[PDB]
């Protein structure tokens with residue numbers, strides 16, 4: 001039985017001021033570097049334990065002993081995402097009900113049905129880059145956000161955000177980003193009801209109304225469509241829980257739409273941004289991925305079957321999720337008194353945070369070269385220890401969108417590598433912006449067309 005270390009404290013504020021930074025996940029990774037596989041982190045009236053080793057996280061992933069917890073970040077996001085799938089407790093009726101109703105929207109048959117609309121948006125991205133002038137550059141995270149928002153809008157809801165028709169972010173995005181930054185900034189506040197934050201609260205409520213106004217319009221656009229969609233919104237409005245026999249009610253549907261619009265794009269745009277970053281910093285890897293794209297994508301319009309054959313592009317995306325998992329933590333609570341790693345006794349209700357980027361740097365798993373971008377690490381899933389690689393979370397509360405995100409990202413990165421040579425013209429220094437999620441900031445490249453027709 002060991003006592004766990006704890007980072008520096010600030011009297012009655014305990015560890016809370018360590019979150020007073022624009023890059024709190026990166027700050028917690030540096031604390032994990034110093035303190036090791038487990039540390040205690042306290043705020044007034046609250047306690048959690050940050051896990052960084054596969055040795056402890058494999059036990060935390062035992063669903064008989066630990067369930068999904070709402071982190072403070074998720075409690076703040078619940079102000080607008082309610083009892084949607086991401087911010088519901090496992091024991092809330094609406095979690096298993098929505099899970100049962102929406103899981104078929106991510107079947108192989110559903111993915112084949114989404115493919116053509118993913119191609120619609122991917123082609124808009126390729127055309128945008130084909131149409132840039134000499135020595136114009138690409139704003140990578142900006143364009144990846146245009147693509148991933150438009151893809152979830154069109155595939156999920158038959159709604160066109162038309163993000164490639166805008167030089168400024170879609171108003172949905174401006175409000176969503178400001179809501180997430182507010183949720184992140186609020187983590188450090190000991191006295192959140194201090195009138196000093198009255199303006200923050202006004203702006204937050206304004207951003208929530210902007211997101212609900214867009215949901216209103218999507219629900220209206222479908223009500224009056226009088227056309228046969230069989231998409232995510234079809235299942236939300238018409239699907240029945242095989243268990244309870246009931247459909248989702250209007251309040252829960254609104255929360256699911258907000259949830260899928262945010263979760264269905266923010267993390268995928270980060271993944272694509274980090275993937276292109278690693279490819280231009282690792283030219284040998286880029287060449288191998290581009291050779292696969294050229295050999296497989298033999299038609300002007302990629303097919304579902306062809307994207308499934310981009311195996312190396314799939315490994316590039318897993319290796320980008322290893323180094324910078326874009327949803328960089330998840331939280332667990334102990335269902336009963338238990339002992340972690342034979343050393344750390346926990347009581348029922350005790351909370352854990354899984355620090356995913358630090359898990360993915362465990363030298364006992366990946367070897368000494370852990371900072372190197374090597375997609376070949378993923379050649380054989382059987383050679384990776386259990387729970388070493390957790391970018392989609394765990395168990396029945398794992399990402400419902402995993403195959404959607406990876407199909408989209410594989411299709412898009414395949415078309416990017418088929419159609420362009422990329423240049424890191426600024427020798428970009430990686431700068432990771434935090435909005436709860438992680439994304440490169442200020443990442444720019446030049447794309448020289450290979451002049452291959454669409």
Ligand SMILES: CCCCCCCN1CCC[C@H]1C(=O)N[C@@H](Cc1ccccc1)C(=O)O
Nearest residue numbers: 024025043048071072073327328329436437
């Ligand atoms: C939206 C998908 C990503 C969510 C990631 C959330 C993960 N946080 C994103 C920012 C930092 C990181 C995190 O460690 N947060 C803890 C912070 C906290 C711990 C103890 C007491 C008070 C507050 C939390 O929110 O509880």
Ligand SMILES: C=Cc1ccccc1
Nearest residue numbers: 081086259262263266
């Ligand atoms: C439900 C909120 C959310 C926010 C960011 C990423 C994924 C999900």
